[PDB]
Each structure stands twice: as C-alpha cells, then as structure tokens.
Amino acid sequence: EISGHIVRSPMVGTFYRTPSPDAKAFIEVGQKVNVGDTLCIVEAMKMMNQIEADKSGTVKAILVESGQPVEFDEPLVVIE
C-alpha cells in the first residue's frame, strides 16, 4: 500500500514551519492543502523557496525538521 505523497527538498537551504513570526504558520501536520495552496519556504541564499502543495491531501509529518538546514532530496513534508 502506498504511503501517500512525499515532498523531497530539491535543493539545500533551511526548512521552516512558521515564516514571518507574525504569520499563521505554514502547512503543518494534520493540515489540509489543495493543489495550488502554499507549503513552506526553503530559505536558500535568501530566495524564499516558498513551495506550494500541488498534490492535495493532508500533511502527515515532517522529516527535514524545520529550523534545520535542508539537503538535496530531503522529505520536507509527507502528505497523507
């Protein structure tokens, strides 16, 4: 059985769950995202790699661990 969809970081940077401290937190666990919705930023050299969920579904968890540097092909967020 498939485990949904997993999003692996395309490059290296810095994962996160809550951008601008004065925000509403990005797509965290138990969250709902639809093809066309935001996801999160990578923060690679100040590029704001703000990804946008394009597979719809409900986030299951994160393996990259926000606040931690990102690496090529890193499960940023796994959707259910």
Ligand X SMILES: *C(=O)CCCC[C@@H]1SC[C@@H]2NC(=O)N[C@@H]21
Binding site for ligand X (CB under 6 A): 16, 19-21, 43, 46
- Using Cβ positions, the residue closest to ligand X within the complex turns out to be 19
Could you write out the DSSP letters of every residue in 33-80?
Answer: E-TT---B---SSS----B---S-EEEEE-SS-TTSB--SS-EEEEE-
For ligand X, the closer CB: 31 or 66: 66
For ligand X, the closer CB: 18 or 57: 18
For ligand X, the closer CB: 2 or 45: 45
